[PDB]
Structure formats: structure tokens, C-alpha cells
């Protein structure tokens, strides 16, 4: 710590001590159903971008590694998460939205993006946490005469809020002349059909898009993956994993009066203080494992190699293990220095009126007032 080979007389603050965890505990909800991701990615027809479906996925075990076998896509474009870690962490509700767009409009399916599709057909929130999947469908959603079954909206009196749908087809009024159900010179139909032909370029080819939206953790968790659970231990320093909330600490029964809609508890520094077990409805505190500071009391290296250790702020009942002498101090507790009834001038200050010195008793480190 001093980056030197000679140490002078005094007390020096070395590295801290920690108590290491014993085992790891995983706690996941008692859920055995399987999520129907196959019927989302394998359908005969997808809906248009103005009438996109929204499938609710809940109360099942989700395996996200089978999505790659279901559809031929390059990447798995996620915002707020990663495609690798989706099998470990878990949510409350999952939402799947499937539609068909053009190739130029795939970049508009993104948070904070505007355009035609983003303003009139499908808007994503700025705080979006979820994964967008897009793959080419020129072999299934195209015809040599031109596929006309996919439509999109061009005209609207305002923009669209995130996650809204527009179904009604009223004639747009672009001028001061009223339409009254007549598509005149200043009136146009708001829906226009996609033109999908196999001879078009790759930027105009149809693309099938599935967007998965995740609700992180506010409700009791219903969509959690295939990670197995472990029995709950208490009054021991262990690793814990509560519905994707990982950590290290000591769990114990609590007197916290949780209201029935509350599943977490936080501290002033925004860390989890109490948790509810997802299998049995009980409240557990989370206390970090025992720690403190370690100080080294020494004379000069040219004098002796003997040493005393002060564990500051730590009762020696909590100290696991270093000499044969143990003394209790208000500044911590002392190991390796014996206590005498005499009083001297202060040589090495420890604290709270306690000093230490090195002298003949042959020679040893003593502590005194």
C-alpha cells in the first residue's frame, strides 16, 4: 500500500475486509406454462400497419432462443435490454405487435423517430424497452400482378401518441371546402395500398415486423424464463436472485407493513431494502454482509517486524479470526497488542484515549490509556 520496502512507525490504513457469500439462491414464480411465440411468428397473413394486432403474453415460461428457428432474420434489435440476457431477467407482461411495412420504413420503427409510419400508423415511446424484429417477405407477401391487400395512412389531422391505433376511414379535408363523404378535388381517401411486386428493388420489398414490448417490474411477475428455483435460506450471507433482481446479502424476516400491491422496497440511496418472495407471500429484509476497515500498527521496519491489527468499527465477536491477544476499544477492536494497566505518553495513536507502543515486557507491542 505504501509502495515501499521500508515502513516507518505508526498506524496505516490498509484494504478493507469483507465476508464472502456461501451459496447462491434463486427465487422465481411457480409457473409451468409455455409462451406461444410460435403462433405469433408463424401466421398465414399479417395485418396492415394501420390495423396492427397486439397479442398479450403472460403467465408462461418464455424461451427467447427458439425465435431464431421460427423466422429468418439477421439481428434482434433491442432497446434497453440485450438479446443474450433475456433468458435470465424477467418481466410482468409481454406484448407482441405484428405488421408489414416497406423496406425504407424499417428505420422508422425506433424510439424518437418520425416520418410517415411513425406519425400516422405506428408510434413507439421514447422510453421504449423491447426488441424489434424485421425480415424480408418478398416470397410470401408479394404477387406478380401486385399485392394490394396491405394499406397505410397518409393523411391525419394530428400526429399519433405512442401505442395508438386508427381504424376509421373518413375522407380527409385538405381545404376549406367540406367533403361530406365525397372525394372531390380537395378531398382524398386517407388509406392507400402498398404496391408489392417481386421485380422491385430491395428498398421497396415488403418486410414483416414483429415488435416485442416489455413491462420491466411493477406488477407481480408472470413471464419468467426457464431458470430453476432454490430453497430459501435466512440469516446467512448469500447471493440472491429475486425475479432478475440479483445481489449479495443477508435475508431475514421483517416487520415491514407492505401494502398488498407493493412488491419492492427502496432506500434513500435507491437500493433494495426489502423484497417479497414470489412463491410464498412473505417479506424479507436485505442487509449487506459484515465489513469494516483494517488498520496496521507497526514500529519501524528497521526496529522489528512485529505488527498489530485494528479492525475499526467492528466488535471482535463479529471478527472471524492475527495474534493471541484480543482487546476491545471504542475505535474498533485490537488484535496482537496486549493491554497494560500503566499509562505512558502517546507513541502511536489508536483513538478514544487508547495509544500503542513497542517496548520490552522480551520486546512486544502493548496498548494503554
Amino acid at each position: 500500500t505504501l509502495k515501499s520496502f521500508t515502513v516507518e512507525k505508526g498506524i496505516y490504513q490498509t484494504s478493507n475486509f469483507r465476508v464472502q457469500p456461501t451459496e447462491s439462491i434463486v427465487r422465481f414464480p411457480n409457473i409451468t406454462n409455455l409462451c406461444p411465440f410460435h403462433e405469433v411468428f408463424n401466421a398465414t397473413t399479417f395485418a396492415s400497419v394501420y390495423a396492427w394486432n397486439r397479442k398479450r403474453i403472460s403467465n408462461c415460461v418464455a424461451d427467447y432462443s427458439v425465435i431464431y428457428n421460427f423466422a429468418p432474420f439477421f439481428a434482434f434489435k433491442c432497446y434497453g435490454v440485450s438479446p443474450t440476457k433475456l433468458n435470465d431477467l424477467c418481466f410482468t407482461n409481454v406484448y407482441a405487435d405484428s405488421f408489414v411495412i416497406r423496406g425504407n420504413e424499417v428505420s422508422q420503427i425506433a424510439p424518437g423517430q418520425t416520418g410517415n409510419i411513425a406519425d400516422y400508423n405506428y408510434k413507439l415511446p421514447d422510453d421504449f424497452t423491447g426488441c424489434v424484429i424485421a425480415w424480408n417477405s418478398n416470397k410470401l407477401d408479394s404477387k406478380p400482378s401486385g399485392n394490394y391487400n396491405y394499406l397505410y395512412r397518409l393523411f391525419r389531422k394530428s400526429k399519433l401518441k405512442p401505442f395508438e391505433r386508427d381504424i376509421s376511414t373518413e375522407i380527409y379535408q385538405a381545404g376549406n371546402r367540406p367533403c361530406n363523404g365525397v372525394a372531390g378535388p380537395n378531398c382524398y381517401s386517407p388509406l392507400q395500398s402498398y404496391g408489392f411486386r417481386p421485380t422491385y428493388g430491395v428498398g421497396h420489398q415488403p418486410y414483416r415486423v414483429v415488435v416485442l414490448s416489455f413491462e420491466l417490474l411493477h406488477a407481480p411477475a408472470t413471464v419468467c424464463g426457464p431458470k430453476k428455483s432454490t430453497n430459501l435460506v435466512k440469516n446467512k450471507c448469500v447471493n440472491f436472485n429475486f425475479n432478475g433482481l440479483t445481489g449479495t446479502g443477508v435475508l431475514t424476516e421483517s416487520n415491514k407493513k407492505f401494502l398488498p400491491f407493493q412488491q419492492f422496497g427502496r432506500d434513500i440511496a435507491d437500493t433494495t431494502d426489502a423484497v417479497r418472495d414470489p412463491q410464498t407471500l412473505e417479506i424479507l429484509d436485505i442487509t449487506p454482509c459484515s465489513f469494516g476497515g483494517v488498520s496496521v500498527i507497526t514500529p519501524g521496519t528497521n526496529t522489528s517486524n512485529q505488527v498489530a491489527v485494528l479492525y475499526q468499527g467492528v466488535n471482535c465477536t463479529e471478527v472471524p479470526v492475527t495474534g493471541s491477544n484480543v482487546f476491545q476499544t471504542r475505535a474498533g477492536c485490537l488484535i496482537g497488542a496486549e493491554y497494560v494497566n500503566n499509562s505512558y505518553e502517546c507513541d502511536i495513536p489508536i483513538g478514544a484515549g487508547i495509544c500503542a507502543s513497542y517496548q520490552t515486557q522480551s520486546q512486544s507491542i502493548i496498548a494503554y490509556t
Binding site: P162, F163, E164, R165, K256, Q262, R266, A274
Partner: protein
């Protein structure tokens, strides 16, 4: 179908520091927490409606209140246009279940259905309806009211019952049916909430009411 609406008699009263809800599902104890959300402002102008009903606006969230011991009030209707054209919520209580439907009921295609547990049983019934990001949240609280006329003095935090993923547009609302109710409108406000040692919100401070509360915030 008929009409049978019995006009609408309006009056105005004071909110009296009412309409506070839990902003999240996180337990907090012995801490002052600042939250920016859609709150009913303190000492606001709320409207009292009597019926011994044209379309009311939905202005960024609705605080609803009722002091009806006789138990005639039973439901709410949401949406934009009450017909078989535009999507509209249909919260009806049958004293056992809450049926929630989006398309139409003709008020004597479909995307969502729901069923629930009974909401209800000298009492005050408070409700907060909020529509953010394709969701629809309902907060509620019952209170053993005394001194029958007007809203009481004090605090009563509104615990959430249901969060409903509807995903449609709301601009107008109606009420199912002597019958008197209070309507106020929420505003984007910053509040300073006080949690006691048991985790219950006891006091609050509205940071935009007067210079003293801005100093407190």
C-alpha cells in the same frame, strides 16, 4: 332507449387538499419524496353535479367523487363518441364482476375483455382515472365520512386497484345512474409526499400553490 336524464344541475365547490394517490408500487417509510405526475391541484375548483347528461370532457385525467350512502351509483362510461363506430370503454358493475369492453353496447372490431372482484360493499368514494401511453389506470379509496355536506378536511391517499391495457383514445365520459357527484381535472404537477413509519402517505405539499409551499419544496 328514451331520454330520462332529468336535466343536469351544476354547482361549484372546493377540493380541500384531496385527490392524492400512490405514484408507484414501491414501499417507502420515513422519507419525503418528490414526484412529478398528473395530480389534482390543492384548493382547486371542482364541479358538483346533481340529478334528483351531455358529454363531459376528459382533460388529462379525471378525479371522481361520490358521497352516496343510498348506493344508486354503479358505473362509468368512457370513450370519444357513444355509438358503434369509435372505440369506447364500458365499465359496468353487476355487484359481482366488472365487465370492460371496447366496441359498443348501443347505450340503452373488438379488442379487449376483462372481469374482476367487486369494488364496493356515511361513506366517500374517490376515484382517479388516468390515460397514459395506451394504458388506463384506476385509483380508488373509501372513507368513513362525517359532517355530510362537502368534501372533508384531511388526507386520504388513493391506493390503486386496477391497471388496464386498453390502448384507445379517451376525450369524453359519462356516468351510469338523489345522484350527486364531484368532478375535477388533473394537471401536471410536482408534489412533495410524506411517508410515515408504516409506509402510509400522510401529508403532501403542492409546489405551485403559493410561495410558502414553493419554499417548502
Amino acid at each position: 332507449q328514451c331520454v330520462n336524464l332529468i336535466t343536469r344541475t351544476q354547482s361549484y365547490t372546493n377540493s380541500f387538499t384531496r385527490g392524492v394517490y400512490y405514484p408507484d408500487k414501491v414501499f417507502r417509510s420515513s422519507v419525503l419524496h418528490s414526484t412529478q405526475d398528473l395530480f389534482l391541484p390543492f384548493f382547486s375548483n371542482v364541479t358538483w353535479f346533481h340529478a334528483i347528461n351531455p358529454a363531459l370532457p376528459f382533460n388529462d385525467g379525471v378525479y371522481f367523487a361520490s358521497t352516496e350512502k343510498s348506493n344508486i351509483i354503479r358505473g362509468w362510461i368512457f370513450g370519444t363518441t357513444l355509438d358503434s363506430k369509435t372505440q369506447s370503454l364500458l365499465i359496468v358493475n353487476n355487484a359481482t364482476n366488472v365487465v370492460i369492453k371496447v366496441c359498443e353496447f348501443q347505450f340503452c372490431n373488438c379488442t379487449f375483455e376483462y372481469v374482476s372482484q367487486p369494488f364496493l360493499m356515511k361513506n366517500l368514494r374517490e376515484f382517479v382515472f388516468k390515460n397514459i401511453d395506451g394504458y388506463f389506470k384506476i385509483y380508488s379509496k373509501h372513507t368513513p365520512i362525517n359532517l355530510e355536506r362537502d368534501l372533508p378536511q384531511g388526507f386520504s391517499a388513493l391506493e390503486p386497484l386496477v391497471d388496464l391495457p386498453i390502448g384507445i383514445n379517451i376525450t369524453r365520459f359519462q356516468t351510469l345512474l338523489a345522484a350527486a357527484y364531484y368532478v375535477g381535472y388533473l394537471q401536471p404537477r410536482t408534489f412533495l409526499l410524506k411517508y410515515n413509519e408504516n409506509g402510509t402517505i400522510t401529508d403532501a405539499v403542492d409546489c405551485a400553490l403559493d410561495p410558502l409551499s414553493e419554499t417548502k419544496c
